[PDB]
A paper describes a structure:
In plants, flavonoid biosynthesis begins with phenylpropanoid metabolism in which phenylalanine is transformed into p-coumaroyl-coenzyme (Co)A. Chalcone synthase (EC 2.3.1.74), the first enzyme responsible for generating the basic flavonoid skeleton, then catalyzes the condensation of three molecules of malonyl-CoA with one molecule of p-coumaroyl-CoA to form chalcone. This is followed by the intramolecular and stereospecific cyclization of chalcone into (2S)-flavanone—a precursor of many downstream flavonoids—by chalcone-flavanone isomerase (CHI; EC 5.5.1.6). Type I CHIs—which are found in most plants including barley, rape, petunia, Arabidopsis, and rice—isomerize naringenin chalcone (2',4',6',4-tetrahydroxychalcone) into 5-hydroxy-flavonoid; whereas type II CHIs, common in leguminous plants, utilize both naringenin chalcone and isoliquiritigenin (2',4',4-trihydroxychalcone) to synthesize 5-deoxy-flavonoid. The family of genes encoding CHI in Deschampsia antartica—one of the only two vascular plant to naturally colonize the Maritime Antarctic—was recently characterized at the molecular level. The crystal structures of the unliganded and isoliquiritigenin-bound forms of DaCHI1 revealed that DaCHI1 can bind to type II substrates suggesting that DaCHI1 can produce antioxidant flavonoids from various substrates for protection against abiotic oxidative stresses.
Unliganded DaCHI1 was crystallized in the C2221 space group with two molecules in the asymmetric unit. Our analytical ultracentrifugation results showed that DaCHI1 is a monomer in solution with a standardized sedimentation coefficient of 2.14. The final model of the unliganded DaCHI1 structure contained 218 amino acid residues in a β-sandwich fold with seven α-helices (α1–α7) and seven β-strands (β1–β7). The seven α-helices were located at the concave surface of β-sheets and the active site was formed between the antiparallel β-sheet and α-helices. The substrate-binding cleft of DaCHI1 was conserved, with hydrophobic residues from β3 (Met36 and Ile38), β4 (Ile43, Phe45, and Ile48), β5 (Val94 and Met96), Leu100 of loop 97–101, α4 (Tyr105 and Val109), α6 (Ile190), and Val196 of loop 192–197. Several important catalytic residues including Arg34 (Arg36), Thr46 (Thr48), Tyr105 (Tyr106), Lys108 (Lys109), Asn112 (Asn113), and Ser189 (Thr190) were also preserved (residues in parentheses refer to those in MsCHI). The final model showed Rcryst and Rfree values of 0.222 and 0.278, respectively.
Residue numbers in the entry:
A (entry chain B), B (entry chain A): 1 to 119, 122 to 216
């Protein structure tokens, strides 16, 4: 089934074919990402979350079938299950405000870094280095998108999309399951950077799970 | 290394990550689809042809290395080798003059099955109707793009892009070598709709094989 959603101006297609992926993805959820400055919620980006067209839902249904929107929303194990699921995920980050690749890299990376510090090998450091070198000569105006593909393997594909042409390569694919998962968890995790996305996601997947029961 | 190509407004990235593909592709060449009408020369389409980054150069290099761009542009066998090669290709079709899903579908359908008419196994008829239906309810204003991915064995992945978002799916992949190859040969083949794209292609690929050949 599944519908297309519009966050701010950004329009997210219902069914998609991501770069670096052989399968179609359905729009699982979408929502604004912003900051709290001076007691005001400034919107920075619009995030869309896509899941593998049939792998996901079948996979989720085993622990989450029957459960409702609020129930799924109130459970961290759910969002960790979609983050870690044995299927392809995809994330679209479209800009409302302008960001630079350096700053973006800087604190999607530094928090993964910090956490891994607390418990972080050389594979992690290398993956991070490839990530930010992928990002530091780039610019993102309003409308510019970042396309993240999270393959079931831990391979992270990075594409960029100003305008309507083919997504442009962000470099070589980065094969590091911790970073690949972490990029997505920064969004949907427990201290997920976009609560709106999580709510939408939970609601829609709930609907899809009930619909299976013919 | 390659360069970005601008074609009446449409920007083609030098290094792309197409949907349906694990690999990066390099912009092999790009040019308009044009046609003489009355007073002037009307631009219909802007087409970009991409080849699998690592593999294309290697596969083409032993029949066509050393050979000059002159020689390539002149010989149809070369373009047959690009169409037929054991590497994956990608092509982007960008409007900049409004067309329908229908209009384009049947743009390509007959000519293939005209060829197939004379020299037509069901698999082609079925594939043709899956293609046709994959397009039927879509509409392409100026700026919109069709994104075709051709795997080595001839499975065709279709996507659409009217913005900076992740490409929207055109449905299930179409597995048929004749049609998959036909879609690209319609562009760079003997009766190839865009001569300019071939010229560009020969020019760039020649320098690439020289570069890579020692």
């Amino acid at each position: 089934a599944v519908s297309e959603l519009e966050v701010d101006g950004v329009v997210f297609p219902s069914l998609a074919r991501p770069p670096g992926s052989a399968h179609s993805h359905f729009l699982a959820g979408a929502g604004v990402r912003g900051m709290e400055i001076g007691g005001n919620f400034i919107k920075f980006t619009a995030i869309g979350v896509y899941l593998q067209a049939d792998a996901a839902v079948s996979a989720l249904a085993k622990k989450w079938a029957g459960k409702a929107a609020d129930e799924l929303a109130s459970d961290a194990a759910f969002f960790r299950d979609v983050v870690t699921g044995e299927f392809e995920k995809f994330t679209q980050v479209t800009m409302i405000l302008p960001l630079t690749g350096a700053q973006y890299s800087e604190k999607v990376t530094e928090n993964c870094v910090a956490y891994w510090k607390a418990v972080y090998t050389d594979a992690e450091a290398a993956a991070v280095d490839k990530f930010k070198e992928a990002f530091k000569t780039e610019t993102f105006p309003p409308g510019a998108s970042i396309l993240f593909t999270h393959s079931p393997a831990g391979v992270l594909t990075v594409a960029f999309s100003k305008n309507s042409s083919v997504p442009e390569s962000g470099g070589a694919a980065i094969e590091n399951r911790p970073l690949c998962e972490a990029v997505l968890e920064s969004i949907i995790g427990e201290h997920g950077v976009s609560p709106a996305a999580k709510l939408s996601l939970a609601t829609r997947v709930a609907e899809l799970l009930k619909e299976a029961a013919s």
